[PDB]
Symmetry: C3
Amino acid sequence: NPNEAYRHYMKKLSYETDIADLSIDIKKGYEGIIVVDVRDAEAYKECHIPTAISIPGNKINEDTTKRLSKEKVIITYCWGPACNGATKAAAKFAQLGFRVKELIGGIEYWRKENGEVEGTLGAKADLFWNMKKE
Amino acid sequence: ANPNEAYRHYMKKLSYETDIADLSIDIKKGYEGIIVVDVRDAEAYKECHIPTAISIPGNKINEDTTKRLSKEKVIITYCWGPACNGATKAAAKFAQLGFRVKELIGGIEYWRKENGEVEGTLGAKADLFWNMKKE
Amino acid sequence: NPNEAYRHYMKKLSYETDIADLSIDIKKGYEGIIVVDVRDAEAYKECHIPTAISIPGNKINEDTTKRLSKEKVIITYCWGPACNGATKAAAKFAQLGFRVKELIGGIEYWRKENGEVEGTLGAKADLFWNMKKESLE
Ligand SMILES: [Cl-]
Ligand SMILES: [Cl-]
């Protein structure tokens, strides 16, 4: 029924955010969020989203987030739609008592949507995770 | 989890959405039990949209703009693609209006990547993705 | 609240797996999973994921799954993000009593993430589903 549907979509929206919404908070300098790149350290060093900090997914714990305020909202992101990293991170952040949303689209679509990137390689970095690279 | 719980989950998920495949079918056979609604900006629509689809910007979904729509048909909302949440937000507003709705995963982005035809001013010449930098 | 949030995220993962996780399973030779390609038979024969068996979604039932172990886990995959195949498939498998998870990204992102492909056309096969090829097949 309509009511059940409404609750469903709203709830789904409460656990996520898209490239468009993020691009606005960054552009307006909203400080109510902390953008966290949960991919590999070297991946972040080569290319990452503006204002984002690095915290590889397997490194999320009390020590690596001691400086993060529980008053803000954590936005996690991985490579893209084909990655589950952002989701695994969200669970860990949540377990640590944070309010968290996962970015849908990842850095892949942030770039496809013509977003700016920072890093050692920038727009020259690989668009996708390379399963064979390692 | 166990099969019983798994079955419920997957079925439920399927009840709130639909893919490019199922859409193309109802469009090919001219099914009229649906109303394809483009939620993106008015300009994007006019430039390139899915066949049989109407234009209703997400931020404009309300009683006034949905007065000619029949609660008898099923609403199918769609935005740019996997990176957009428009279709989802649109579904909530539509369900809030007492409608029966489903969001289209893939957006018009995959409708094209899947050799789908489009109508509009620029047609297949329109940009594939949303441009953050465009004013 | 954090508590509910944790339950939500954990449950979402319990019904899926990604390219990365599957690649590690294929490489480590894990036998606790059964990769099932749910697309059209022809598509599979042309290009599919290593160690995966062909079982078209519309052809899933007790006859085609009789020789599959219930002790393992079924991983379904369709073309990609814009497909519901794997999800419809998961449901049927769950109805048959199997433990199952769907692969997000499908074969599309498997190949994009530089994955190996086996089949007739291999890496030369089409990357996306062709809406027109249907009438022609
Ligand atoms: Cl108005
Ligand atoms: Cl692409």
